[PDB]
Amino acid sequence: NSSPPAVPQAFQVAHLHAPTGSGKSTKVPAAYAAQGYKVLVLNPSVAATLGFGAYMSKAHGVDPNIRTGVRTITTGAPITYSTYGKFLADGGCSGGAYDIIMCDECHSTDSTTILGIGTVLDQAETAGARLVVLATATPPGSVTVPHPNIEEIALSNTGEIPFYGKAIPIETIKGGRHLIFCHSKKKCDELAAKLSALGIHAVAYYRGLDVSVIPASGNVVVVATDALMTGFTGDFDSVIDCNTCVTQTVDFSLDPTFTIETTTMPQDAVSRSQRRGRTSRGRRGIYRFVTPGERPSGMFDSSVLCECYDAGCAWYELTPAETSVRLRAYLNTPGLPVCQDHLEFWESVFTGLTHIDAHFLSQTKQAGDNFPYLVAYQATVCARAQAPPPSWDQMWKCLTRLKPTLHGPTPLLYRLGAVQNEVTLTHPITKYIMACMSADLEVV
Numbered sequence: 001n002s003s004p005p006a007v008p009q010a011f012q013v014a015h016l017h018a019p020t021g022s023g024k025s026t027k028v029p030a031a032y033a034a035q036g037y038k039v040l041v042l043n044p045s046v047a048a049t050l051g052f053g054a055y056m057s058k059a060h061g062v063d064p065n066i067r068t069g070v071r072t073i074t075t076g077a078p079i080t081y082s083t084y085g086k087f088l089a090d091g092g093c094s095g096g097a098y099d100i101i102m103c104d105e106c107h108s109t110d111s112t113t114i115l116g117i118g119t120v121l122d123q124a125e126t127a128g129a130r131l132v133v134l135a136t137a138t139p140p141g142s143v144t145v146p147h148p149n150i151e152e153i154a155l156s157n158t159g160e161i162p163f164y165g166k167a168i169p170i171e172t173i174k175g176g177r178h179l180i181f182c183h184s185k186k187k188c189d190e191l192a193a194k195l196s197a198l199g200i201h202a203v204a205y206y207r208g209l210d211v212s213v214i215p216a217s218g219n220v221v222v223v224a225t226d227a228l229m230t231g232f233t234g235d236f237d238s239v240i241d242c243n244t245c246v247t248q249t250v251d252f253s254l255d256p257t258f259t260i261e262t263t264t265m266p267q268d269a270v271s272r273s274q275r276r277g278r279t280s281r282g283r284r285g286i287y288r289f290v291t292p293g294e295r296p297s298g299m300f301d302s303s304v305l306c307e308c309y310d311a312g313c314a315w316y317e318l319t320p321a322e323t324s325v326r327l328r329a330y331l332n333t334p335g336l337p338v339c340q341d342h343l344e345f346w347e348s349v350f351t352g353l354t355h356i357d358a359h360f361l362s363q364t365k366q367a368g369d370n371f372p373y374l375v376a377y378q379a380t381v382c383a384r385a386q387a388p389p390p391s392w393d394q395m396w397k398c399l400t401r402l403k404p405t406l407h408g409p410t411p412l413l414y415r416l417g418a419v420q421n422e423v424t425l426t427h428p429i430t431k432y433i434m435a436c437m438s439a440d441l442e443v444v
């Protein structure tokens, strides 16, 4: 729906589909507050959370409470803005705290948002909340739609420059400023170089480099990865999309258990719109693609589920069972992103990961990398077996100081990236996870 759901006598979960800026996260809550309700707005971004608070006090004479992982500001106002992570850090809902609870960007598929939303969905009513709103500008199942200012031209085989099974006719990049999207930070160099060697001024671009490496004037063909901003100065004439992106995915490769790496999946609606949106700003744009079909938005990998249990164990003092109750509340609620139901599986997996090294965990938590609990656990297992990590990549930095006293094969519990060192598959925990996969009628 495009209108703020009225407040119900008892309870209700409603949906709010509105664009960013129409005031769905500010004006809407302000109205609920003018009515005497106490409102809590959750968002994935610290910046956004701050953005709403500023807007509110500056436009509606209301200095709302703002809560983030860094700190919380309390003004005693009836409106409160918090990040999902801080909300969870806080234990979730607090009795008699809020009448309404809006879950903004509820289409987000990062583990913190999903877990946070599950939490709201499960505790809201017990918490005395009368209403829970699932707000978002990108409803699940969305598809890229036609834009009034963008001409979409499909790539064909004709063209000297080969491009993902299709071709890029030189004619289309000779003159003007064009943005080409490639999936791998490498594939970029492969293209920028082929075009530079054809008279075409092309400057590659991917994570690491600087914005400066992109002249702001004169013809140019920028071959980049999604590293390029979404709000950065577009002013592009045409964008060529490879229609594929790199994303985190879980593979039950039975070697010995599972693998969580980054794979290239077909691009989805949200992705397609964002890349296409890099053209036709203040003028008419061109959009060339290799593939028309796209996966609708609102779908996420099983590995995010894993990421949710990992987080419940690492930061929120949540047993794998508690996480499940919360994640289940999320899967039973229609209108939110979907994923294969692997709750039982992941639950049983983390449950077996007991007696984790506190110091290692604390090291992975603040280190900031993904899956701090699984990294720390694989390390705990390693140290206890005086074995080295699967690799000496930054991932395993918490084991650097014992490097000397670590010999023999690595007791691989699972694969979280490149595994160089030799590996043994005889560890009880490895055997425990292997069995978790066999005990499942939807896993293996």
Ligand SMILES: O=S(=O)(O)c1ccc([NH+]=C2C=CC(=C(c3ccc(Nc4cccc(S(=O)(=O)O)c4)cc3)c3ccc(Nc4cccc(S(=O)(=O)O)c4)cc3)C=C2)cc1
Binding pocket: 019, 020, 021, 022, 023, 024, 025, 026, 027, 044, 045, 046, 047, 048, 050, 051, 052, 055
């Ligand atoms: O819908 S509503 O009508 O209710 C409404 C009302 C008011 C709104 N205000 C906003 C204000 C700011 C922002 C974001 C933001 C974007 C850029 C920012 N830039 C600064 C630049 C210079 C100085 C500052 S300073 O000094 O911190 O004040 C900030 C700051 C904040 C900001 C924008 C997009 C963001 N995008 C992300 C995209 C991907 C991932 C993330 S993540 O960090 O992973 O959460 C964030 C993050 C932050 C978003 C919204 C917004 C909406």
